[PDB]
Design a protein around this ligand. Structure first.
Ligand SMILES: COc1cc(/N=N/c2ccccc2C(=O)O)cc(OC)c1O
Ligand SMILES: COc1cc(/N=N/c2ccccc2C(=O)O)cc(OC)c1O
Ligand SMILES: COc1cc(/N=N/c2ccccc2C(=O)O)cc(OC)c1O
Ligand SMILES: COc1cc(/N=N/c2ccccc2C(=O)O)cc(OC)c1O
Lengths: 116, 116, 116, 116
């Protein structure tokens, strides 16, 4: 219930998610940045029996019917309930690269999600 | 096909994955370290129409029928096919923490998966 | 000039730094969290001829005359001038560990520094 | 003594370091990748009174007499002594960027240094 809903990050990206009773996370992601357009499928897992924030993570491969950025982002964070529910994350964005360029394949950042 | 199979990291953890034609990653993860025992459900996404490496990612919430470590790991990387196929990753392990311990909620590492 | 001064992060930690004409960073760090007390020596490097933020980084080994946490933090970020000068960073905190526990040796986070 | 010497990462970059009794790391870094040429000054800190691995870190701003990549890398890790001494690190490479490209300013990787 807590997790399920629409969330936006500081970049203006949109995350629509449903938390299943089995610890599954499914929804779609709409990105404000990068080489993207439209929504992308997301899938993740969360602690369906948390103690403290709720640990969760999700992935988006930046490929839909319109574009392919040949990359994937994984968000690792925790959900924090209250008046102002937030999802605090750290993410890794890996681009498919040649062996020579593999060293600079992964970006790291942090996103804060606000529930609408 | 290539991604689909049983993989092992340096630590001896086992990742059994099924790669869907649509870009879905589904499977089971069995760890060799941490507050864990047995297999855990994994879910991810991958680039199903790659260009050189194949971008992918997945999440495991460290909760099963036996234990709950109140944490989740996300692996972000690329599959490199060939005679000696590998999955080179970087991971974030976030524990559910109180707001006071939030600064030290996330661990970062790298794992190399092979079929051996 | 820009970089040189007293800065505080969101945790209430204190960073006193002087930027040398040669791209050197020296000062002391006073931590609000962890197993620390008093100041610790810091050393870093910055782009003394920036274009865009100014790229910089610094390290602190958590050892002084009073305590030893057997760990080191490296902050990688950029300085951004203006009315409100800020240092936006990502950090890695590695703890000396045995080979068995090396996998969980490194924490990752992000700090924003405000100049006073 | 142990840390002091010439080390090489997987990429073939060369790290010449001097470890001070007081916990200072000073030296030169010569890269094998990126918008770089020649040696760059490095500065860091290390635990000079370790317990098993030895925590350390260092920074290189990618500016010298020949080029300026307007970026800086920080390596955070541990020195493991013995017959086959190694320095296992994780690094953050931040480029100076405009505020619009700040989200993708930082790369993350891992380097293993040996004396061979
Ligand atoms: C690699 O190239 C691309 C990058 C991209 N980054 N998104 C993100 C990545 C990490 C964290 C947040 C976002 C966020 O959007 O909130 C999005 C793309 O789809 C537009 C794309 O093609
Ligand atoms: C929350 O702290 C925990 C950490 C944990 N590390 N595993 C991993 C973490 C990152 C990358 C690989 C592994 C790997 O095992 O391959 C496993 C746990 O199992 C419950 C656990 O609770
Ligand atoms: C490992 O154990 C310790 C950890 C510690 N984290 N500091 C930090 C680490 C990363 C980022 C910010 C801080 C910050 O303080 O702003 C500080 C210690 O000195 C108190 C200490 O012993
Ligand atoms: C700003 O983008 C750049 C990246 C760059 N990568 N080096 C490294 C980065 C991280 C870890 C190891 C290395 C290593 O070389 O061992 C080197 C540059 O030299 C100017 C440069 O400009």
């Amino acid at each position: 219930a807590g997790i399920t809903g629409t969330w936006y990050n500081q970049l203006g990206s949109t995350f629509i998610v449903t938390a299943g009773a089995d610890g599954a996370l499914t929804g779609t992601y709409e990105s404000a940045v990068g080489n993207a357009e439209s929504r992308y499928v997301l899938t993740g897992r969360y602690d369906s029996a948390p103690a403290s924030g709720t640990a969760l993570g999700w992935t988006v491969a930046w490929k839909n019917n319109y574009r392919n950025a040949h990359s994937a982002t994984t968000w690792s964070g925790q959900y924090v309930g209250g008046a102002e529910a937030r999802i605090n994350t750290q993410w890794l964005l890996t681009s498919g690269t040649t062996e020579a360029n593999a060293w600079k394949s992964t970006l790291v950042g942090h996103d804060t999600f606000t529930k609408v």
